[PDB]
Design an enzyme around this catalytic site. Structure first.
Site, short mmCIF file in Angstrom:
data_model
loop_
_atom_site.label_atom_id
_atom_site.label_comp_id
_atom_site.label_asym_id
_atom_site.label_seq_id
_atom_site.Cartn_x
_atom_site.Cartn_y
_atom_site.Cartn_z
N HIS A 1 1.87 1.75 -3.46
CA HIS A 1 0.74 2.51 -4.16
C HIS A 1 0.64 3.94 -4.07
O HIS A 1 0.65 4.85 -4.87
CB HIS A 1 -0.55 1.92 -3.97
CG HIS A 1 -0.86 0.52 -4.46
ND1 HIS A 1 -0.28 0.15 -5.75
CD2 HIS A 1 -1.39 -0.46 -4.23
CE1 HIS A 1 -0.65 -0.96 -6.11
NE2 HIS A 1 -1.30 -1.58 -5.10
N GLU B 1 -0.17 -2.11 -9.45
CA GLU B 1 -0.04 -3.06 -8.78
C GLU B 1 1.35 -3.78 -8.83
O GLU B 1 2.06 -4.43 -8.06
CB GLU B 1 -1.23 -4.20 -8.83
CG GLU B 1 -2.33 -3.84 -8.11
CD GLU B 1 -2.34 -4.17 -6.81
OE1 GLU B 1 -1.15 -4.47 -5.99
OE2 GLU B 1 -3.30 -3.87 -5.80
N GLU C 1 0.87 -1.19 -0.07
CA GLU C 1 0.01 0.03 0.14
C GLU C 1 0.70 1.31 -0.06
O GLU C 1 0.56 2.46 -0.54
CB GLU C 1 -0.94 0.13 1.22
CG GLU C 1 -2.05 -0.95 1.13
CD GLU C 1 -2.80 -1.06 -0.07
OE1 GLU C 1 -2.98 -0.01 -0.50
OE2 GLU C 1 -3.42 -2.06 -0.59
N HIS D 1 -15.86 -11.89 -11.79
CA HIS D 1 -15.29 -11.14 -12.90
C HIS D 1 -16.05 -10.96 -14.17
O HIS D 1 -15.92 -10.16 -15.25
CB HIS D 1 -13.92 -11.14 -13.28
CG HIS D 1 -12.72 -11.02 -11.91
ND1 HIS D 1 -12.92 -11.58 -10.79
CD2 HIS D 1 -12.01 -9.97 -11.73
CE1 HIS D 1 -12.13 -11.13 -9.69
NE2 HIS D 1 -11.51 -9.99 -10.49
N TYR E 1 -4.17 -9.22 -14.66
CA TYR E 1 -3.25 -10.03 -13.99
C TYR E 1 -2.26 -10.52 -14.90
O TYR E 1 -1.17 -11.33 -14.20
CB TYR E 1 -4.47 -10.84 -13.32
CG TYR E 1 -5.52 -10.32 -12.45
CD1 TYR E 1 -5.25 -9.62 -11.37
CD2 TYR E 1 -6.92 -10.40 -13.24
CE1 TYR E 1 -6.43 -9.16 -10.70
CE2 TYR E 1 -7.72 -9.76 -12.56
CZ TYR E 1 -7.58 -9.23 -11.44
OH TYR E 1 -8.98 -8.35 -10.87
#
Ligand SMILES: *[C@@H]1O[C@H](CO)[C@@H](O[C@@H]2O[C@H](CO)[C@@H](O)[C@H](O)[C@H]2NC(C)=O)[C@H](O)[C@H]1NC(C)=O
Ligand SMILES: *[C@@H]1O[C@H](CO)[C@@H](O[C@@H]2O[C@H](CO)[C@@H](O)[C@H](O)[C@H]2NC(C)=O)[C@H](O)[C@H]1NC(C)=O
Ligand SMILES: *[C@@H]1O[C@H](CO)[C@@H](O)[C@H](O)[C@H]1NC(C)=O
Ligand SMILES: *[C@@H]1O[C@H](CO)[C@@H](O)[C@H](O)[C@H]1NC(C)=O
Lengths: 194, 596
Positions: free
Chosen positions: B360, B384, B357, B487, B497
């Protein structure tokens, strides 16, 4: 003997907007500046032309004080030879400046929860500012070939925008108070010293 | 050059209004997500409605500009971003129909329930239920019935909804100079600029295939080893030459293989590194983890953390009459506001999700100087990817013993590395074929190459041809297997991903090479390396101002995706797997099924 009213400028309750900054003259008024220097309250005290340490011997005829409130990341625009939104339409200094500026944070006394929209600044203008000039006009800006008719629409904008100061924003968005001192050596006799 | 000036003088006013509106919306959202009540939800709704209306109106107003007479690429990208809003570019009745279809699909997915076929009064859900029974249980019939019940109660309801949803989405897509709801999704992977730097959406469908073709053999080795090991548990159902049943992969769908570790430990006579008692006995609180992460980030040259971050961030649960949403996330409120919301416990996984985090947050902090419609990632996978390499860096035993969590005389062994590499592989390399399959299937359904008759027959053959998974029971054309996934039924893309997994190891290898590190790539630590931080900051300083090809080149020096770092990361594991698979079959055949 007389002191000098620097407490009505730096300690004033209400400041002015960038496009309507106030101007004040210093009369035959014995003034001291080392008291201003030795105060750990300003985040920016840099002087062009004169040196602050040896600034109690020179004598000047009139001293000018200008005050307004800007954002945190706009203090660098109050300087000679600077380009930007603020120092092209609101307040511009000349290249032969012989005074200096004072800036400090005003978040606690100028930020409120929900927003303080009492401060406004110019965004659109045709030409430059011709240093030491003010303009208070609400005429609608015309961008395209089609003339505007006093109404807001396509390619017609209102050249005034308000700030959004809030108590939670970052340092580059906290409001800052700016005071600019200008010294002039007129043809009249030097009336006051330090 | 007459429209240039008008666009330049309009984007300024747009930015000035958008900053304030977005800040209000984000502040309302943060206030709701901490002090949840009905008034807070009302405030969220009333704040979001105004921002949405303003954005739509501004896009409609800007739709009278043309991209051809604008030569400056800085504002051309801004105009393209603002104009591209073709979600309301449809009739009102069709839009309402689409929204109600999404709403009913979401309600069916969330409310769905399956019952025990031998105990009628016990019926379970997904989150407190089927997910746990797949994660833990071992019995063949239990998993089989739990799988089949979910498949038969989700697909039966979501089949015609998806069938009539496809045509509506294609109608929406063929209004923005797009041919289907495919290319529309791939359009994020778009770039323009100098020669040799352009990238259209038709090159991704080839780059992905090339990368998977190069990846395949390592997955084949891992699959063969897992198949050989998964015979001491079910020694009546697994064919040495066949595939693996879908209801034995540690998950409902097979997304992750991480739950097969206890059944597939290489060396089970020694525990893995779990530094939690060390922090418990040393007196560590929630703040110390974040201070350590700050020190790690400032060691490489990145800036400090804002003073308001330490005051406005909820780093721990309040523990009072204030119920909160406990899920780790990083916020960019705007106007120089950065906060982190996460429940913090004294444990190692929190110690890693804190670095994630903070990565980020640093990435968000980096591009704050760019215009408003340029403050984002570059290829929807950069965020990510940047945030996950810090987790890899701050998990090495050298880093752990460099901060006071391991004894100074701790000598690292060799049997543990195989276990750690296999654990990482089961999560990283065991999900790429699934993602590639799902995305290719969705693309080729949207294009129209699969008719309604071949809708559920191509899926259950592509799976055994690519992934190597066969169904335990036959499925006719009344089921909808892909719809039984979050999804697929909630309109989320499924290439992030894959692209992130590709970029992560390239970034890690470039940073480790910059730091002059010797040895294996999986024992690399980028602490006390100013050049690596400088290169990373040079990368993450642009956002969407330049094409992502330049962003990639600023670090790795490559113009496109590369997978050699990924194979280099898993070299010792590959060698060990090859040594272990001497008397076993490597591949698989697609003519076997456990019902014929
Ligand atoms: C504005 O008024 C305040 C008083 O409210 C002045 O505060 C001075 O503060 C320092 C330390 O913080 C004290 O040592 C001084 O004695 C205070 N001055 C007085 C007159 O009490 C502040 O200096 C004033 N600002 C200016 C520019 O004079
Ligand atoms: C990064 O460098 C710092 C100092 O530049 C290291 O901190 C010191 O590490 C030595 C070990 O050689 C200790 O004896 C000192 O007490 C540490 N001082 C401080 C202030 O931390 C740090 O260990 C280095 N980190 C890595 C991973 O090499
Ligand atoms: C939460 O909201 C309620 C009203 O919605 C308010 O009375 C209370 O003070 C809030 N709590 C916090 C911690 O802000
Ligand atoms: C362009 O401007 C005209 C009026 O000048 C307006 O009617 C039209 O709707 C605008 N274009 C779009 C796409 O809204």
């Amino acid at each position: 003997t007389n002191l000098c009213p620097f407490g009505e400028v730096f300690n004033a309750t209400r400041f002015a907007s960038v496009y309507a900054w106030n101007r004040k003259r210093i009369s035959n008024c014995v003034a001291d500046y080392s008291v201003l220097y030795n105060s750990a309250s300003f985040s920016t005290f840099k002087c062009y032309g004169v040196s602050p340490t040896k600034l109690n011997d020179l004598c000047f005829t009139n001293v000018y004080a200008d005050s307004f409130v800007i954002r945190g990341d706009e203090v660098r625009q109050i300087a000679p030879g600077q380009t930007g939104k603020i120092a092209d339409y609101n307040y511009k200094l000349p290249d032969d400046f012989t005074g200096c500026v004072i800036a400090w944070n005003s978040n606690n006394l100028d930020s409120k929860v929900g927003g303080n929209y009492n401060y406004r600044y110019r965004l659109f203008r045709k030409s430059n500012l011709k240093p030491f000039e003010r303009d208070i006009s609400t005429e609608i800006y015309q961008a395209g070939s089609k003339p505007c008719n006093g109404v807001e629409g396509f390619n017609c904008y209102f050249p005034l925008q308000s700030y959004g100061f809030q108590p939670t924003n970052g340092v580059g968005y906290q409001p800052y108070r700016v005071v600019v001192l200008s010294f002039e050596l007129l043809h009249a006799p030097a009336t006051v010293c330090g | 050059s007459i429209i240039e000036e008008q666009a330049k003088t309009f984007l300024d006013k747009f930015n000035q209004e958008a900053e304030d509106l977005s800040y209000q919306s984000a502040l309302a959202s943060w206030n709701y997500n901490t002090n949840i009540t009905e008034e807070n939800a009302q405030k969220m709704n009333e704040a979001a409605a105004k921002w949405s209306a303003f954005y739509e109106e501004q896009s409609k107003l800007a739709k009278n500009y043309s991209l051809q007479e604008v030569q400056n690429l800085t504002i051309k990208r801004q105009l393209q971003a603002l104009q591209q809003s073709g979600s309301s570019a449809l009739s009102a009745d069709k839009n309402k129909q689409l929204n109600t279809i999404l709403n009913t699909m979401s309600t069916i997915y969330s409310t769905g329930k399956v019952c025990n076929p031998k105990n009628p009064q016990e019926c379970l859900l997904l989150e407190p239920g089927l997910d746990d029974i797949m994660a833990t249980s071992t019995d063949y019939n239990e998993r089989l019935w739990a799988w089949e019940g979910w498949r038969a109660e989700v697909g039966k309801q979501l089949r015609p909804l998806y069938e009539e949803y496809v045509v509506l989405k294609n109608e929406m897509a063929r209004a923005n100079n797009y041919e289907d709801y495919g290319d529309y999704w791939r359009g994020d992977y778009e770039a323009e600029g100098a020669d040799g730097y352009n990238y259209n959406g038709n090159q991704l469908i080839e780059d992905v295939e090339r990368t998977f073709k190069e990846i395949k053999p390592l997955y084949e080795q891992l699959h063969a080893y897992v198949r050989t090991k998964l015979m001491n548990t079910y020694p009546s159902y697994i064919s040495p030459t066949g595939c693996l049943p879908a209801h034995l992969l540690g998950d409902m769908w097979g997304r992750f293989w991480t739950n097969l570790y206890p059944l597939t430990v290489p060396f089970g006579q020694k525990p893995n590194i779990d530094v939690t008692d060390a922090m418990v006995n040393q007196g560590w609180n929630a703040e110390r983890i974040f201070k350590e992460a700050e020190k790690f980030f400032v060691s490489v040259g990145l800036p400090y953390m804002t003073q308001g971050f330490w005051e406005n961030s909820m780093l721990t649960d309040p523990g009072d009459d204030r119920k909160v949403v406990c899920h780790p996330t990083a916020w960019d409120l705007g106007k120089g506001d950065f906060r982190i919301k996460m429940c913090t416990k004294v444990t190692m996984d929190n110690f890693l999700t804190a670095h994630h985090e903070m990565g980020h947050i640093q990435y968000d902090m980096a591009y704050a100087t760019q215009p408003f419609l340029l403050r984002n990632g570059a290829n929807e996978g950069f965020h990510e990817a940047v945030g996950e390499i810090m987790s890899l860096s701050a998990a090495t035993p050298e880093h752990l013993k460099s901060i006071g969590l391991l004894p100074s005389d701790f000598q690292e062994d060799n049997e543990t590395e195989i276990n750690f590499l296999l654990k990482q592989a089961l999560t990283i390399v065991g999900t790429l074929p699934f993602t590639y399959m799902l995305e290719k299937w969705r693309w080729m359904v949207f294009k129209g190459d699969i008719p309604k008759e071949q809708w559920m027959e191509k899926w259950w053959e592509m799976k055994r041809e690519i992934v190597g998974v066969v169904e335990p029971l036959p499925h006719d054309e009344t089921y909808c297997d892909p719809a039984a996934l979050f999804h697929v039924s909630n309109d989320y893309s499924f290439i992030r991903y894959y692209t992130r997994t590709i970029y992560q190891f390239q970034f890690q290898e470039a940073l480790c090479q910059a730091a002059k590190h010797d040895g294996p790539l999986h024992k690399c630590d980028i602490s006390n390396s100013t050049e690596a931080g400088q290169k990373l900051l040079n990368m993450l300083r642009l956002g969407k101002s330049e094409p992502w090809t330049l962003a990639l080149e600023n670090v790795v020096g490559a113009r496109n995706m590369d997978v050699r770092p990924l194979l280099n990361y898993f070299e010792p594991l590959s060698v060990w797997l090859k040594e272990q698979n001497k008397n076993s079959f490597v591949g698989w055949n697609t003519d076997w099924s456990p019902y014929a």
